[PDB]
Amino acid sequence: GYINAAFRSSRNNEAYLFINDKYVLLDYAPGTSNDKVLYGPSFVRDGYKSLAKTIFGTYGIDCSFDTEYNEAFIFYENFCARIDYAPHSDKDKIISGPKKIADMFPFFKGTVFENGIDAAFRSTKGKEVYLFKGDKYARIDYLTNRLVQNIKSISDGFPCLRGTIFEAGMDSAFASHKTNEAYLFKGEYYARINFTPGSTNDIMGGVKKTLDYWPSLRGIIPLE
Ligand code: NA
């Protein structure tokens, strides 16, 4: 029972983490030791009343990403939705969906991403987003609803993850609040990377046991 989906919050140094059919709010503090759970662990149906009577409320969220403002895309199997998550409030809503992925992001029809996406994080370049399913990754523009490039292996786009357990799959991801950085999660292992849009940039090697560096997740992962 580990991290399944994350998206960066619009509130500085904060992130939402989705585990099983549950979620937590966290001050993941990249520049500090002072890490901490802000809200939860709660059920998605309880925390997000907008999602209470949906498949997400029943099953949780297996992939998500920050777009802009207080908005983020959330997925579960072949369906997905845009919602406003309303940081620290009641006032959270469904904006778009729930649609199938192939109706939200048409270009995905015919590919591995059509029946489900593993994880995803917001790129620093414009309205761009990187997504992961299996051992391939996509580069999209959610605003113009197009694929910026052909879908290639994580090994090809991200050379730093070669020879790491992250080479054949990522369970969860989110972008840091710091420039060109994102976190990746697979099982009990995590890594902080420094990504440059449109490059074969290596670094880093920092594959660490998640509980070792996230003090405030002991008791939550592994969620039994
Ligand atoms: Na996932």
Q: What's the CA-to-centroid distance between 51 and ligand 1, angstroms? A: 18
| Total of domains in the chain | 1
Write down the residue that tokens 């440059």 correspond to: 196
Asked whether the beta carbons of 37 and 24 are under 8 A apart, the reply is: yes
> What would the 3-class secondary structure string for 4-45 be?
EEEEECCCCCEEEEEECCEEEEEECCCCCCCCEEEEEEEEHH
CATH number of the domain that 121 lies in? Answer: 2.110.10.10
**β-pairing verdict for 3-8 and 181-186:** unpaired
Beta strands of 79-197 (E only): which ranges?
79-84, 93-100, 119-122, 128-133, 136-141, 146-147, 152-153, 172-175, 181-186, 189-194
Write down the residue that tokens 């490039």 correspond to: 149
Within 10 angstroms of residue 151's Cβ, the number of other Cβ atoms is 18
DSSP 2: -
Token pair of 48 as six digits: 């997000």
Best CA proximity match to 74, nearest among 46, 50, 39: 50
Supply the Cα-derived Rg of the chain in whole angstroms.
16
Token pair of 152 as six digits: 């290639």
As a whole number of angstroms, the distance between CA 93 and CA 74 comes to 12
Resolution in A: 2.5
As a whole number of angstroms, the distance between CA 132 and CA 224 comes to 25
Q: What's the CA-to-centroid distance between 91 and ligand 1, angstroms? A: 26
Q: What's the CA-to-centroid distance between 134 and ligand 1, angstroms? A: 10
Q: What's the CA-to-centroid distance between 197 and ligand 1, angstroms? A: 23
- Cis (ω within 30 of 0) for the bond into 204? yes
DSSP 143-175: TTTEESS--EEHHHH-GGGTTSGGGS--SEEEE
**Residues, CB within 5 angstroms of ligand 1 (ion):** 4, 62, 118, 171
Q: What's the CA-to-centroid distance between 12 and ligand 1, angstroms? A: 24
As a whole number of angstroms, the distance between CA 147 and CA 126 comes to 14
Q: What's the CA-to-centroid distance between 75 and ligand 1, angstroms? A: 9
Asked whether the beta carbons of 87 and 131 are under 8 A apart, the reply is: no
Could you list the residues known to form a binding site, using ranges: 4, 62, 118, 171
With a CB cutoff of 8 Å and minimum separation 6, the contacts of 134 are 112, 118, 168, 169
DSSP 51: G
DSSP 52-67: TTSHHHHH--SEEEE-
Asked whether the beta carbons of 221 and 3 are under 8 A apart, the reply is: yes
Best CA proximity match to 75, nearest among 140, 177, 172: 172
> 209 forms bridges with which residues in the sheet?
189
As a whole number of angstroms, the distance between CA 85 and CA 95 comes to 10
Structural domain for 121, as ranges? 1-224
As a whole number of angstroms, the distance between CA 5 and CA 172 comes to 5
Q: What's the CA-to-centroid distance between 56 and ligand 1, angstroms? A: 13
Q: What's the CA-to-centroid distance between 88 and ligand 1, angstroms? A: 24
Write down the residue that tokens 């015919």 correspond to: 110
As a whole number of angstroms, the distance between CA 103 and CA 125 comes to 24
Could you list the residues known to form a binding site for Mg(2+), using ranges: 4, 62, 118, 171
As a whole number of angstroms, the distance between CA 210 and CA 179 comes to 22
As a whole number of angstroms, the distance between CA 128 and CA 116 comes to 19
Asked whether the beta carbons of 219 and 212 are under 8 A apart, the reply is: no
> 26 forms bridges with which residues in the sheet?
15, 37
Residue 204, classed as helix, strand or coil, is: coil
Q: What's the CA-to-centroid distance between 126 and ligand 1, angstroms? A: 24
Residues 6-27, buried b or exposed e (16+ Cβ, 10 A)?
Answer: bbbbeeebbbbbbbbbbbbbbb
Q: What's the CA-to-centroid distance between 73 and ligand 1, angstroms? A: 13
